[PDB]
Design a protein around this ligand. Structure first.
Ligand SMILES: O=c1ccn([C@H]2C[C@H](O)[C@@H](COP(=O)(O)OP(=O)(O)OP(=O)(O)O)O2)c(=O)[nH]1
Ligand SMILES: [Mg+2]
Length: 240
């Protein structure tokens, strides 16, 4: 059913063109990404996830750059920031128009204000050397929620250190959470460190097929993310 209150937002940033159920910004100037370091894009963008929903923020490029896929919580009242990492050992440049920045809604449930995800504790110690990708197997099934699919997203704090999580479905036999260290340090994550977050997405948001108003970039190679069809409505007073 069509049950999305507007997404209220305010936007101001002369280095990004607002193009825009999905808001998209394009870069106007070249963005240089240092290697081995986190690159951050300040968006000038404020946005209220409407009732029942969270927001998903992600960068899309065909350059050798990986975006953190951001979960925006209903309680978040600040300016949105995009987190990028460089796949290469030298500077990578994003020429104008090469980077699109998307924001769109999704319905979520919370199992038995108020964050979307539940942070997940690492069951083992994990070391990651510069540029290594490794996975952590999670075995114990989370509680089933009718009409929703458990999915793993990364956290921004770890993303800022250069550790990205590939978003993925937590399928009924367990999950392999892939982490990539984009930094110049060996990172040691201690057992019980909260290393990602579990989000129960409404099943409508995951599709194995090329549907309208969906995107193959976000959740992996075998799904597309299909967002809630909501209307963005500019409320400048949100800025701050
Ligand atoms: O790419 C992103 C991701 C998140 N956020 C904002 C919205 C979100 O509600 C908040 C916290 O993000 P996250 O939950 O990923 O951070 P954390 O490391 O889990 O910190 P916290 O414990 O405060 O949630 O930061 C962004 O601006 N950009
Ligand atoms: Mg969080």
């Amino acid at each position: 059913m069509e049950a999305c209150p507007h997404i209220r937002y305010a936007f101001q940033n002369d280095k990004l063109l607002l193009q825009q159920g999905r808001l998209t910004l394009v870069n106007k100037t070249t963005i240089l990404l240092r290697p081995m370091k986190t690159t951050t894009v300040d968006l000038g963008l404020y946005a209220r996830p409407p009732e029942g929903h969270g927001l998903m923020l992600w960068g899309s490029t065909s350059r050798p750059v990986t975006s953190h896929v951001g979960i925006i919580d209903p309680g978040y009242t600040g300016e949105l920031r995009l987190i990028l990492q460089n796949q290469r050992r030298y500077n990578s440049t994003l020429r104008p128009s090469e980077l699109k920045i998307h924001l769109a809604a999704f319905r979520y449930a919370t199992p038995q204000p108020g964050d979307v995800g539940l942070d997940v504790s690492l069951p083992k110690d994990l070391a990651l050397f510069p540029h290594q990708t490794v996975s952590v197997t999670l075995t114990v099934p989370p509680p089933s929620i009718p009409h929703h699919r458990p999915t793993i997203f990364g956290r921004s704090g770890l993303a800022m250190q250069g550790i990205l999580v590939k978003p993925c479905r937590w399928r009924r036999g367990g999950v392999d959470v892939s982490l990539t260290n984009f930094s110049d340090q060996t990172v040691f994550l201690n057992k019980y460190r909260r290393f990602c977050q579990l989000v129960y997405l409404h099943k409508h948001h995951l599709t194995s097929f090329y549907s309208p108003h969906s995107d193959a970039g976000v959740l992996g190679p075998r799904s597309l993310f299909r967002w809630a069809s909501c209307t963005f409505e500019e409320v400048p007073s949100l800025a701050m």
